[PDB]
Design a protein around this ligand. Structure first.
Ligand SMILES: Nc1ncnc2c1ncn2[C@@H]1O[C@H](COP(=O)(O)O)[C@@H](O)[C@H]1O
Ligand SMILES: Nc1ncnc2c1ncn2[C@@H]1O[C@H](COP(=O)(O)O)[C@@H](O)[C@H]1O
Ligand SMILES: [Mg+2]
Lengths: 290, 294
């Protein structure tokens, strides 16, 4: 698609739905006393996205190598350390994944509504996301006149049982008709692990649409954080100012999640490919024309 | 300042105010039938920010994506015009920008990363946009009195000055802001190719805050005609090559007359909390010429 073809697509209904979704979700959080933060796109530190079942793009800023935002996870933990209590942000992310990830669900630029709550536990956040999704689905039925999944609470699968029964979260999505949780997934250092149990969670949409939200409780203790980083083969100086805050003992227990906005729009409009809900497509492996 | 000093600052009140401002502004637009778009951060093309009397001529930060040069968003102006070309009629976006301005721009009003609420309206004229901004600002200031218990400028509409006359009377827009006690408009400012120019008159506008706080909003009617646009690019010494896909759209006759503006969120927060320096309202400061530690 050249530039003219890109702007010649019909996208009005998807954008109409997107506007209603953003209105609903931002209000959901401000109604519950969340602070609305603005994003950052450049920092000496960012989410490594590893280990996880790709290097961040970099640019020089006044002589210092900065990373483009993979995700604001570390900055959300810092906002909690500043005592903001409950926060969310509409955060753009840049993830330059390969052509292989062009599966209809991935974009190399996207936005997630990313939130964090001081002191929250995994079951708190999951219940909160269930409340958000249930309400959103009921409204979407009014917006679109179509029927959406009806459950107030979603089945919870352990990561292991998903690999056991379906082989992958992929096959799982295709087989289900309700959103479902996958919990206890070994991954990045910031996610809390206790007694071999990872206190984290992914919300998977039915009908093959795949993951829509992901989060967890956080590690906040210096020794434990550095251990997981070293163990993973990550370099500590990639996270220096963060670890300095951790060493100072200023990180606080918290839990949160990110919700992929375009993935949600795609589900509600029922679009075959995520690019169809984006005015300026950002397809993995295909550098954007505009 | 270092990481621990940053996280130790007390900015709860500014963030509480920011939350109320974002709630108010986004509702203002959706209430009026505007569509809410998500931002783009990388693109082959971006706002040149030049010519522009308010800038020094910075080049966008660049990064390769699958081997192809992309520019980090200076502003989404060209993308707003393309959204209008897609028939979305009335649009807004909370758009983060990256502008690596020099230390000379560290005047308390600039940050090298910031967000603007950027909006565009198909068919609108400068008077329509200016009046909509007045409606938004007046209503915001009335709410701010309740949020803070302090007094804010009460004007329902703001006075209008030509740029040329500002220079003559005050010497600069900075001096003008220091002398005024209510917000005011500066219009007819020769600048970038996308602002509409007709027989020597630029159809554009900056909202300036009083008490030295400076500019908080800027916009204009747009050019949409290929030959007019190309001539302005060439006259400024810019390169058609830098705007190739946009110029393809323009050559095809698919740009439409429109007008819009951007409103600096952090600048507005700063004004309402009375902060000396914009860094005081940002959880992670981005001070011009100083690479941030976090
Ligand atoms: N490449 C991508 N394209 C579109 N959406 C994404 C992408 N990666 C993540 N998301 C969304 O953002 C959410 C948070 O992702 P994460 O930061 O990876 O845990 C996911 O649950 C998805 O909804
Ligand atoms: N460097 C900056 N730091 C903070 N806010 C800015 C900066 N540049 C522009 N703004 C705000 O964004 C609005 C739109 O800017 P512009 O795209 O330059 O017309 C301005 O009116 C300011 O309120
Ligand atoms: Mg300007």
């Amino acid at each position: 698609m050249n530039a003219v073809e890109i702007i010649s697509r019909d996208i009005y209904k998807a954008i109409d739905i997107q506007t209603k979704i953003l209105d609903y979700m931002t209000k959901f959080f401000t109604d519950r006393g969340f602070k609305w933060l603005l994003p950052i796109m450049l920092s000496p530190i960012t989410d490594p996205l590893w280990p996880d079942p790709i290097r961040p793009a970099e640019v020089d800023v006044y002589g210092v190598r900065m990373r483009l935002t993979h995700s604001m996870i570390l900055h959300k933990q810092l906002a909690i350390a500043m005592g903001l209590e409950k926060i969310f942000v509409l955060s753009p992310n840049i993830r330059l994944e390969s052509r292989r990830k062009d599966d209809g669900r991935h974009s190399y630029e996207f936005t997630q509504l990313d939130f964090e709550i001081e002191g929250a536990k995994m079951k708190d956040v999951m219940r909160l996301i269930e409340e958000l999704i249930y309400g959103l689905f009921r409204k979407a039925e009014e917006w679109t006149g179509r029927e959406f999944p009806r459950a107030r609470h979603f089945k919870v699968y352990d990561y292991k049982d998903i690999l056991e029964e379906f082989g992958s979260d992929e096959k799982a999505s295709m087989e289900m008709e309700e959103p479902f949780w996958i919990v206890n997934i070994p991954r990045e250092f910031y996610d809390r692990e206790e007694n071999g149990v990872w206190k984290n969670y992914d919300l998977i949409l039915p009908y093959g649409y795949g993951e829509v939200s992901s989060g967890g409780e956080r590690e906040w203790e210096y020794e434990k954080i550095v251990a997981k980083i070293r163990a993973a083969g990550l370099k500590e100086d990639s996270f220096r100012p963060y670890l300095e805050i951790a060493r100072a003992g200023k990180l606080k227990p918290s839990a949160g999640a990110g919700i992929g906005v375009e993935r949600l729009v795609r589900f509600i409009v029922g679009a075959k490919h995520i690019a169809e809900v984006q005015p300026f497509p950002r397809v993995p492996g295909i550098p954007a024309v505009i």
